[PDB]
Amino acid sequence: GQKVHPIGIRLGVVKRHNANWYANPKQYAEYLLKDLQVREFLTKKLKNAMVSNILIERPSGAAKVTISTARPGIVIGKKGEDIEKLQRELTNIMGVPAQVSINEIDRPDLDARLVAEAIASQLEKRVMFRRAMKRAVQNTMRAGAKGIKVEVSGRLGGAEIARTEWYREGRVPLHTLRADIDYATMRAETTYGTIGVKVWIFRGEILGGMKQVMN
Amino acid sequence: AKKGMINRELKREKTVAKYAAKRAELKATIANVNASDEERFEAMLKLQALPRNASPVRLRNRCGLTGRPHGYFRKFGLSRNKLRDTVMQGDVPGVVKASW
Amino acid sequence: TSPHVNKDARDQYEIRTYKRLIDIVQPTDKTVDALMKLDLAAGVDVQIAL
Amino acid sequence: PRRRVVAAREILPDPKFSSQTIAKFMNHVMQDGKKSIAESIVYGALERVQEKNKVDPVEFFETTLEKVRPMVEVVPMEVRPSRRTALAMRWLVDAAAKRSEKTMALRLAGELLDAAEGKGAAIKKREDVHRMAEAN
RNA sequence: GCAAGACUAAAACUCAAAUGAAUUGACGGGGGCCCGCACAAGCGGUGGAGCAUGUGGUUUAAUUCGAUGCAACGCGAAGAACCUUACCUGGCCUUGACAUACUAGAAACUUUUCAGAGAUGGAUUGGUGCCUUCGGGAACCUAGAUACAGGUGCUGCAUGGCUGUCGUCAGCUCGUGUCGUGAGAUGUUGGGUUAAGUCCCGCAACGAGCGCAACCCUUUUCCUUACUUGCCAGCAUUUCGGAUGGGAACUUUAAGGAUACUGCCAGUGACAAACUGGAGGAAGGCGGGGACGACGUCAAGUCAUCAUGGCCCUUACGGCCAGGGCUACACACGUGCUACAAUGGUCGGUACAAAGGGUUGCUACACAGCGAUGUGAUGCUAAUCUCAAAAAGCCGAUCGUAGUCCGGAUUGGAGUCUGCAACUCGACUCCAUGAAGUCGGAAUCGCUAGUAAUCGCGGAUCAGAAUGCCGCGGUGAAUACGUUCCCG
C-alpha cells in the first residue's frame, strides 16, 4: 500500500518545520508563494554546492535564509562576493532585506538528500544501479547510521519494462513516531526517461519529545 | 494549465487593476441620491460601456505554481496537489496532520 | 490525496493560532527601553499598545 | 457475537414509579429519541386506568403483562424469560396502535383494560402462537 | 473358433517430445480449527411516488475530456449565465499571448474620440522620464531576422511522483549450524492463551529485521501557574442590566503535571502464560475516538495538476474574440432529499447548545415595505462588537381520519439582490394553483451505545449559485440464545 510521508507525519512530533514565521490570512499566501520561489531559485543555483536544507524565517519586516551545505567554501565564494550576490538576489525576490546564513554539514553520509543526489548523479552517469545502491548503503552504515533503506524505480539499465529495486541495512522503524528518520526523494534524468530515488536514514530514537526538541 | 490560459488570467488582472478606480467612481455616482437622475443614468451607461475584462467577476483563482483552476484554497494560494506536496515536505509553517 | 479520482482518500490538515495577553502596570522608566531592546524571535508576532 | 458474551444493558428505573417494567414499556413505545412524548403516552394510560377502575397502576400492568406473556418459541423451544416480556410489549404496542381514539395514550389504556378481560389482538396473537405450537 | 473374436504381426506418415519419482505453491462441491454486523436476534432504510444529482443511451453544430464489478456512477468538479472552457458556428493573427540568442529606433506611459459583436484598426492630447568614468547605459515599448516558442494533441502497455484494493488482514523475511545428489527442509512446526507471529511451555536448531503493541492528537477525574476582552461565591451601591465599586472564590480559557500498574482480596489455570469475581477509585483489565496501513497483488487509476522518453501539428492539432453548448430528452440505472400524517399539521406563549466565520467583511438600533430587502446609523482587525433566531422540547387552543387545516410538485401573475449581462440558464420573496403520493414485489443496504433514529447550527469552494462534502452539538433506543447453514 501507500505510505505516509515520514517527515510530514512527524512535523509536530520530533521534527521542526522548514519555515518559521507568522502572517495573518491577508499576507499568508503572498509570503508562502515568495518562499516557494526562493526555494526553487536556491535549488537551481546551488545544484553543485551540496545543499540539502533551506530554512526560511521572517523575524521582523526582514528575512533570514539558513542554507545547510557540505560545500561552505563554494557557497560562500572566493572572497565572500557570492553570499553578497545571493543576498541581493534574495532581497530582489522577497521584497524585504534578507540575510543568508551558512550551516556546515560535517557528516554528509547521514543526510538523506545528499545520498539521494549522489545516487541520482551516478545513475545519470550510467553506473550500475545495484552497485550504486550497495555502495551508498555501505558508506552510510560506515558513517554511523543505525539503518538505511534505498529504493530506485523506473527503467533500470534501459529495460523496456520498468521495475523497483530496494536494499536495506540495519533498522528503519517507520511506524515509531519518535524515531529520527530522514527521508529524501530525487530524480535521475536518463536517455530513457526518469528514474526515481528514495532514501530513508534512521539515526536513533528521540526521547523527551517536542519539549526536548525545543519547538 | 496552458501558457495561453495563464497569460489570459494575467491580462485580466492587469485590466481590472487599470480600471479599478473609474469603476468605483461610477458605482458611487450611481449610488448617489443627491445626484440627478440623468447623472446616475449616464454613470450607468459609462459603467456598461467599460471593457468587459475590467469586471472582477471574470477573474478565476488559479494555483500559484501550476495554474490549476480547481481546488484553490484561498489561504495558501495553491491548488490541492501542490498544497499536499508542500505541507508534507514541511515548507508551510504551522500546518500539521489533524487528528481529534 | 489522489491526483484523479478517490473522494474518500484525503488528508486532513489543521493550523492553530495561539494568543497570549500580558499587562504591565506601574511601568518604570527602564521598562519601555528594555522591552524595545528585547529581541524579536521569528514566528511570534508582538503588538504593543499604550 | 462469536466468542464473547455481551453483558445485558441495564436500564434505569423510571423516575416516577421506580419500575423497570414501565421504563422498558416506555422504551418500546418511544420513537426517534422522543422520550417525553412516550412518557406522556404511557403515564396518561396509567392515570386513566386508575380512574376507570381502582387498582395499583403498577400491579394492574404487571398482571396484564403476565396474561399476555407467551411461553413457547416457533422444532419446538421454550422462550427464555426476557423474550417473554420483550414479545408481550411488542404485541401490546402493535395491537394498541390500530384501535381508534383521539390520543395514543387513550388507545393504550383501552387495550390494557381489554387485555385484562381477555379480549385484544395481543392475546389472539398469543393463542395463534399457541396453535402453531400445538401444530408441531 | 459355431459366432463374438483370440494368437502371430508390419509399413507409409507425423511430433520433439511422451514419461518416473520427488519439491514449492495454488485449488478441491477433501478433513480438522478460528475470526468478522457473515449469519441469527433487533431498529431503521433502498427497490414504489415527486424532486435533486451522476452515469448509460438517444439527440445535436457541439452536447469538451477522463473515471467502468466489489475497488466507476453527489467520482476529478472545495461549487459551467460571461469567465472557467478544454467543445461548436462565425470573425481574425502568424517568431506568435510567453522564453533565450542578434540587429535598430523610441522613456515607459497618458487624454479625447471614430468604425466594429468584439478581437482589432484609425485619427488625437499631454509626458518624454533613472544612472552616469557621463561619447552610453538600466528597465520598458515598437520594427526586422532564425534557431525556435506553443500544443488539456497520442502512448498510464515506455516512465517519475501520487492514489485505490485485498485490508488494519497477521503475517513476511535473513545469518551460522544440521538433513538431502538435488529443487529444498529445519528454524517459523508441536500444547495452552490473546484483538495480534500477543505471551508462556516443548523441540537440530542457535541467533536477528520489518510487521503487532507503545511513543503522537482528542475526551473523562484532580493539582500548579496564569485573572482579561472571560467569571460573580462573600461585601456595598444600584436605572435590578456583573450595571457599578469591588473579589480571585467558582465556571471557563490553556500550558505544564498527577493518576491505572492486575496495584489489593478471593477463586481457578498447570504446580506457567493467562482467565472469572470483589473493594476502593471519576475511571479496571484494550475506558472511548483519531492518526499511523508490513512483504506483496491487480501491465488497477492518473501523460487533463505537475514532471518526463518516444511519436505527431507548425498561416495550425498554436494564439485572440463574439454568440452557442457542457443545463438537450421516447428511455434505463446508481446515490440522495421531501412525503404519504394525530408519537401529527397550524396558531399563541415560553426554555436549554456546541463548533465555526467576519475589514472588498459581519452588523447593534431606527425608519419604509406583507416580504425578499432598501436607506440612515453604530461597534468590531474580535473571550470585547457581530452572524444569531438554535430546532426538536414544555404549556394552551384547534383540526377529528378526510387525499384532509396531510403533502408541496407543477403552472399563471407580480417583485428583490448579485453581476457589464439572469432568454437559453441564478438564488430568494409575495399572491394564486394544489400533482403523484394511503408506507411501497422479487431482492437488497446501514448499524452492537451516547451507537442507530430524529432535530437544528457552521464552514471550504465562492460576485451570486448545496438536498452534495467536511464538521458541531440537542433528545436518545431495541437486540445479541448461539455458529447448524449465507458470505469472506
User: What SS3 state is found at A31?
Assistant: helix
Over its C-alpha atoms, chain A yields an Rg (Å, rounded) of 19
For residues A34 and A94, the answer to whether their CB atoms sit within 8 Å is: yes
- The 3-state DSSP class for residue A23 equals coil
SS in 3 state form for D94-115?
A: HHHHHCCCCCHHHHHHHHHHHH
Taking any CB pair shorter than 8 Å as contact, residues of chain C touching chain B are 1, 3, 11-16, 43
Q: Which nucleotide is nearest to B75 (CA to C1')?
A: E460
Cα–Cα distance measured from residue D77 to residue D70, given in angstroms and rounded to the nearest whole number: 12
For residue A181, the tally of other CB atoms under 10 A from its CB is 22
Instruction: Fill in the DSSP letter of residue D77.
Output: B
Check if the beta carbon of residue D114 is closer than 8 Å to that of residue D53. no
Q: Give the count of beta carbons closer than 10 Å to the beta carbon of residue B18.
A: 12
Of A14, A9, A2, A4, nearest in space to A212 by CA: A14
CB A130 within 8 A of CB A157: no
Interatomic CA distance for residues D59 and D62, integer angstroms: 5
- Would you say the C-beta of D133 is within 7 Å of strand E? no
Whether the Cβ atoms of residue B96 and residue C10 lie closer than 8 Å to each other: no
Q: Which residues contact A156 (CB under 8 A, 6 or more apart)?
A: A129, A162, A163, A165, A195
| Same domain, residue pair A94 and A149 | no
Do A24 and A115 sit in the same domain of this protein? no
Instruction: Provide the residue range defining the domain that includes D13.
Output: 2-133
Residues 12-51 of B with CB under 8 A from A: none
The C-alpha atoms of residue A98 and residue A61 are separated, in whole angstroms, by: 10
Exposed/middle/buried for residue A3 (C-beta within 10 Å: 0-12, 13-18, 19+): exposed
Strands, sheet with A98-104, edge to edge from the N-terminal-most edge strand? A19-20, A51-57, A63-69, A98-104
Q: Which residue type occupies A141?
A: M
For A38, name the nearest residue in chain B, comparing CA atoms only.
Answer: B91
- The method recorded for this entry reads cryo-EM
Q: Are A58 and A31 a contacting pair, CB within 8 Å?
A: yes
Cα–Cα distance for residue pair D107/D109, rounded to 1 Å: 5
Say how far apart CA A160 and CA A189 lie, in whole Å.
16
Task: Give the residue numbers spanning the domain of A101.
Answer: 16-106
Q: Nominal resolution in Å?
A: 2.2
Residue A100's DSSP bridge partners are A65
CA angle D5, D9, D13 (to 5 degrees): 155
* Number of residues in chain B: 100
Residue A63 distance to chain B (closest CA, Å): 15
By CB atoms closer than 10 A (0-12, 13-18, 19+), residue D45 is buried
Residue from A21, A17, A5 nearest A210 by CA? A17
- Compute the distance between CA of residue D61 and CA of residue A129 in angstroms, rounded to an integer: 85
Q: How many domains does chain A have?
A: 2
Residue with cell 416457533: D74
Residue A35 falls within a domain, yes or no?
Answer: yes
To the nearest whole Å, the CA of A57 is away from the closest chain C CA by 6
Which of A82, A106, A130 finishes a domain?
A106
- Positions 1-60 of A with beta carbon below 7 A from strand E are 1-5, 9, 12-13, 25-26
Residue A112 maps to a domain: yes
Do B and C share at least 3 CB pairs under 8 Å? Answer: yes
Q: What are φ and ψ of residue D36, in 5° steps?
A: -65, -40
Phi–psi pair at A14, nearest 5 degrees: -135, 5
Separation between Cα atoms, residue A77 and residue A58, nearest integer Å: 25
Q: Same domain for A122 and A189?
A: yes
**Residue A134 DSSP code:** H
> Residue B38 corresponds to which cell in the numbers above?
440623468
- What is the distance between the alpha carbons of residues A125 and D26, in angstroms, rounded to a whole number? 81
3-state SS of A41-75?
HHHHHCCCCCEEEEEEECCCCCEEEEEEECCHHHH
User: Which residues of C are less than 8 Å from A57 in CB distance?
Assistant: 42-43
> A52: left (phi > 0), else alpha (psi -120 to 50), else beta?
alpha
Are both A89 and A164 inside the same structural domain?
A: no
A195 domain residue, yes or no: yes
Q: How far is the CA of C2 from the C1' of E388 (A)?
A: 39
A1 part of a folded domain: no
Non-local CB neighbours of A11 within 8 Å, separated by 6+ positions: A17, B90, B95, B96, B97
C4 DSSP 8-state letter:
S
Residue A3 counted as domain residue: no
Which value, in Å, is the radius of gyration of the alpha carbons in chain D? Answer: 16
Cβ contact B82:A10 at 8 Å: no
* DSSP annotation string for D22-76: HHHHHHHH--TT-HHHHHHHHHHHHHHHHHHS-S-HHHHHHHHHHHH----B---
d(CA D46, CA D61): 8
Q: How far is C27 from chain A (nearest CA, A)?
A: 25
Determine the Cα–Cα distance for residues D22 and D43; give it in Å rounded to an integer. 9
Dihedrals phi, psi of B19, to nearest 5 degrees:
-100, 15
> In whole angstroms, how far apart are CA D106 and each of D29, D40, D44?
14, 11, 7
Q: Which of B46, A174, A129, A22 has its CA nearest to residue C42?
A: A22
Q: Answer whether D65's CB lies under 8 Å from D57's CB.
A: no
Which residues lie closer than 8 Å to C24 by C-beta, 6 or more apart? C31
CB-defined contacts B:C, below 8 A: 22
Domain for residue A10, yes or no?
A: no
How many domains, in total, are found in chain D? Answer: 1
From the candidates A5, A40, A55, which should be mutated to test the interface with B, based on the most B CB atoms within 10 A? A5
Task: Go through A100-112 and write b for each residue having 16 or more CB atoms within 10 A of its CB, e for each that does not.
Answer: beeeebeebbbbb
CA of B25 to C1' of E349 (A): 52
For chain B, which residues make up each domain, given as ranges?
Answer: 1-90
Which chain A residue lies closest to C14 (C-alpha atoms)?
A12
- Phi/psi zone of residue A157: left (φ > 0), alpha (ψ -120 to 50 degrees), beta? left
Q: Please give the single-letter amino acid code of residue B31.
A: A
Looking at the structure, do residues A120 and A202 belong to the same domain, yes or no? yes
Element (H, E) at A33: helix A28-45
Q: How far apart are CA A165 and CA A150, in angstroms?
A: 8
